Amino acid sequence: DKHEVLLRMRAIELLAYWEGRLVTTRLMNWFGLSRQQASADIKRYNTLYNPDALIHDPSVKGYVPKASFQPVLTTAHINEYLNMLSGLVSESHALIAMPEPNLAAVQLPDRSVRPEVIREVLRACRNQSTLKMIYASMQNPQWHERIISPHTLVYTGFRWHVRAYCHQSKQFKDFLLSRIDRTPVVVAIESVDPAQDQQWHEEIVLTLIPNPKLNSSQQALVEKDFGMPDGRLQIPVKKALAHYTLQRYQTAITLAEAEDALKYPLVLQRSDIE
Amino acid sequence: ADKHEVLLRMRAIELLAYWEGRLVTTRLMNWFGLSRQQASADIKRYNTLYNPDALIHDVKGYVPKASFQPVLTTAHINEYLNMLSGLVSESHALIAMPEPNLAAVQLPDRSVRPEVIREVLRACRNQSTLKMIYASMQNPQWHERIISPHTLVYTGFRWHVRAYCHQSKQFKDFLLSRIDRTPVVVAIESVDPAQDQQWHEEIVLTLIPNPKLNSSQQALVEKDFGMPDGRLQIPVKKALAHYTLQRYQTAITLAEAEDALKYPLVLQRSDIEKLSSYLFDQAS
Numbered sequence A: 001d002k003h004e005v006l007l008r009m010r011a012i013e014l015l016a017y018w019e020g021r022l023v024t025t026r027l028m029n030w031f032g033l034s035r036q037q038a039s040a041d042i043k044r045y046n047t048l049y050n051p052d053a054l055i056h057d058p059s060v061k062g063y064v065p066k067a068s069f070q071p072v073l074t075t076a077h078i079n080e081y082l083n084m085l086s087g088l089v090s091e092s093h094a095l096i097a098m099p100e101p102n103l104a105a106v107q108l109p110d111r112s113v114r115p116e117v118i119r120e121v122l123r124a125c126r127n128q129s130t131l132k133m134i135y136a137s138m139q140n141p142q143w144h145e146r147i148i149s150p151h152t153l154v155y156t157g158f159r160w161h162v163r164a165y166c167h168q169s170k171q172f173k174d175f176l177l178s179r180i181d182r183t184p185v186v187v188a189i190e191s192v193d194p195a196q197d198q199q200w201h202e203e204i205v206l207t208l209i210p211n212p213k214l215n216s217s218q219q220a221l222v223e224k225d226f227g228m229p230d231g232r233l234q235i236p237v238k239k240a241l242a243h244y245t246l247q248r249y250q251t252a253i254t255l256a257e258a259e260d261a262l263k264y265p266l267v268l269q270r271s272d273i274e
Numbered sequence B: 001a002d003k004h005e006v007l008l009r010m011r012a013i014e015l016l017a018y019w020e021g022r023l024v025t026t027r028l029m030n031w032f033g034l035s036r037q038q039a040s041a042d043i044k045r046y047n048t049l050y051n052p053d054a055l056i057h058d059v060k061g062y063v064p065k066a067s068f069q070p071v072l073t074t075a076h077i078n079e080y081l082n083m084l085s086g087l088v089s090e091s092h093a094l095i096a097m098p099e100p101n102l103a104a105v106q107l108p109d110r111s112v113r114p115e116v117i118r119e120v121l122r123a124c125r126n127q128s129t130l131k132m133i134y135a136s137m138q139n140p141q142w143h144e145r146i147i148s149p150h151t152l153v154y155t156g157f158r159w160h161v162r163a164y165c166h167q168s169k170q171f172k173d174f175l176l177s178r179i180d181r182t183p184v185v186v187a188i189e190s191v192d193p194a195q196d197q198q199w200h201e202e203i204v205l206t207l208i209p210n211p212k213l214n215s216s217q218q219a220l221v222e223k224d225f226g227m228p229d230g231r232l233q234i235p236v237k238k239a240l241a242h243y244t245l246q247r248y249q250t251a252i253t254l255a256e257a258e259d260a261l262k263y264p265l266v267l268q269r270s271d272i273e274k275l276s277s278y279l280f281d282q283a284s
């Protein structure tokens, strides 16, 4: 089964698992299917993908998941349900998306990343090319020339950057896409092998724990909030993405942050701080 | 004429052209499982019915005309990432790699249970009243709450339901990770969500570069947030204002603001007064 069919199989699984009820009319409205094709899709799911996981409930005039029901196409993350609904309605321009009634999603609409920059940066990552561009940083906020060999575009959840060799500092660094003036241009200067970006290829395990300033009842709640399996979250990450992962989890890194236990219920275990 | 699946192929053509500057027929064929004949028919359709002569053959595929404008998508990079992320199954990963040269930092949620979503969502749709078991940082022992939920909210970090709390007679935010077992529908008359004043009242927050940064530094913050007058104006519901400020990593306190390079973006001092008390909007 190819993309079209699988996306419908995925929608059947998600409606049943997260809503607890699947009616053909929802599938019809989502995909513009006939009632016949929608019914046949539910049959294919209940026959080929998740055998007898769905039970017709004539009362609720719909299908419900059996108590045995486990997803087979999706992970059991609620992220899967939000991603399905968001793909049916694009509102990436909105501060607050409303993919369906009774659901609001807080977004960060990004206007600052130009297509002409992405086009060049992505081509240079694919070609392992070198770029000449105009940049500004907090350290050096006057526009200046930079020569970079990019390997990977990165979305942090807040900002876009490219991981690139800087030919002046001879270091692998993170370059903000919002801070590139005009169109980068390809130059015939030898690029550095991305396999030499140690921080990028080296993995570390971050251990996040409930804030020690919380009482033990409050700590049990933090374990629940983060679905911690054994009183911690262990997150394997590339060294060069570790800082961004911690900010994505809103983890306390600093002493004054960890002191505000209500604001920062999650801290990085000290050994890892080093 | 075009249903979801055809509209997805059209958007994909447009986003590859606009963001990558090149559309290779093999990319289409692999993404949607098309023959070269179906792939070329899709390009012909976008080029005929959607964006007349926007694409030209050249590379085993097509390039945007110099006058190329997107017709199906806003010029937000979010649309490109959304399209790519829809094609692969990576909602579980710390770091998604939706294509070989793009890494996305994600927050996979491990705490929201489907039996809770099933009951809360149905109750939102039905305007029902629920009894449930809840714990807060204030009262971290399990206790009963009686709620009339109206909206599920994802903040970018956590999931909550906006609901009327029948004991406190106040609309509050209940974290979905803090419900134990399955909520039960009860006979109590639900409360009209039209009475949630904080949900219905819109406000406008003003975000500025951190005044501790020098003039040159402040100009880059303006470039980062596409705000060339020096102010970013955020219209938002009062009950979502704190979540918006957090999603933007904005300083709201003096102590926060004092750290310029951690908080380059700050809330205007005169707007602090318009904000609710965060940890009074949270259920007990």
Ligand SMILES: [Cl-]
Residues within 6 Å of the ligand: A126, B099, B100, B101, B102
């Ligand atoms: Cl790529």
